[PDB]
């Protein structure tokens, strides 16, 4: 099934290997590091505390 | 035996509104390609077209702005307006006014009907109005030229373009898009080795096919006549 953005122009795919994992959200490194940094960490583990 | 058979054109299969297919029947040997590539280069090079040049939208300073109540940016409206094929019928330059209010698309049929300006396809969308009390007004300046004339070489002496609210579009006064000649055998009775050049042009709608071939052969023969009287040095 397809979303309504994919019923516009569905790109023909030659992938033969059945995929298992999605591509993860590509900006996890920078966002997760700065979320560890500025955070009220209740124990003294991460960032400012 | 040695004189020649001269080509005369035969039926013009107007197979679509834009398409065409002309045929030049009793051609001699080897002049098929000689006239075919000549006419392809001439037709594709230099024909009189009637593209647009200046659009003066009502409340618009520059093309890099948007307009409120319309869906395309102004630059996309200009890129839609460049491809507006229009055949001016009486004069050289002309000014077309477009006024449209309320939701819906704006095809080129909403351009104010002049007598001597015939929009060839009224389906050609221009901009998409997207609101109820939203309107547009522009003076499309259409003039007749030849060959690709960009806006950079257009501004020579500024031409008194003191209104800043007038946008300048690049011009493409050239009705043709593809020519593809094709030689074959000409089945006249008392002759074997003749050709029959089948030119299959694809205009945008402004130019007539017979007038395209007529201007092409005319401009070739008029470039030619520095030779038929040689005038040695």
């Amino acid at each position: 099934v397809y979303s309504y953005t994919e019923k516009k122009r569905i790109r023909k795919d030659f992938g033969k290997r059945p995929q298992v994992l999605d591509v993860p959200y590509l900006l996890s490194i920078q966002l997760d590091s700065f979320q560890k940094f500025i955070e009220q960490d209740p124990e003294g583990q991460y960032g400012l505390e | 035996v040695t004189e020649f058979l001269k080509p005369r054109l035969v039926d013009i299969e107007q197979v679509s509104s834009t398409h065409a297919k002309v045929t030049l029947e009793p051609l001699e040997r080897g002049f098929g390609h000689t006239l075919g590539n000549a006419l392809r280069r001439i037709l594709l090079s230099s024909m009189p077209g009637c593209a647009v040049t200046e659009v003066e939208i009502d409340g618009v300073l520059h093309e890099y702005s948007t307009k409120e109540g319309v869906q395309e940016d102004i630059l996309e409206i200009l890129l839609n307006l460049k491809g507006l094929a229009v055949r001016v019928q009486g004069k050289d330059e002309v000014i077309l006014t477009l006024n449209k209010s309320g939701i819906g698309p704006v095809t080129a049929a909403d351009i104010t009907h002049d007598g001597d300006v015939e929009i060839v396809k009224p389906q050609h969308v221009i901009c998409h109005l997207t609101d109820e009390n939203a309107s547009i007004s522009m003076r499309i300046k259409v003039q007749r030229g030849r060959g690709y004339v960009p806006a950079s070489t257009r501004i020579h002496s500024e031409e008194d373009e003191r209104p800043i609210g007038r946008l300048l579009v690049d011009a493409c006064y050239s009705p043709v898009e593809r020519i593809a000649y094709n030689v074959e055998a000409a089945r006249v009775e008392q002759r074997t080795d003749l050709d029959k050049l089948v030119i299959e042009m694809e205009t945008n709608g402004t130019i007539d096919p017979e007038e395209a071939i007529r201007r092409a052969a005319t401009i070739l023969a008029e470039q030619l006549e520095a030779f038929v009287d040689l005038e040695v040095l």
Binding site: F14 | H33, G36, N37, R40, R41
Partner: protein, 50 residues
Amino acid sequence: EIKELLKLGDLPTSGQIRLYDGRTGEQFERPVTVGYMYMLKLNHLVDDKM
């Protein structure tokens, strides 16, 4: 799969068609490879270099 795609359209399976010359109209010998490469444009623009 590319050959079956080229046979789905009317194209020749080699991907190689008979280009003709521009200025003469004599056909090129040894027919050439035409297709649709997705070309880019980089910002080593000559007006920023000259």
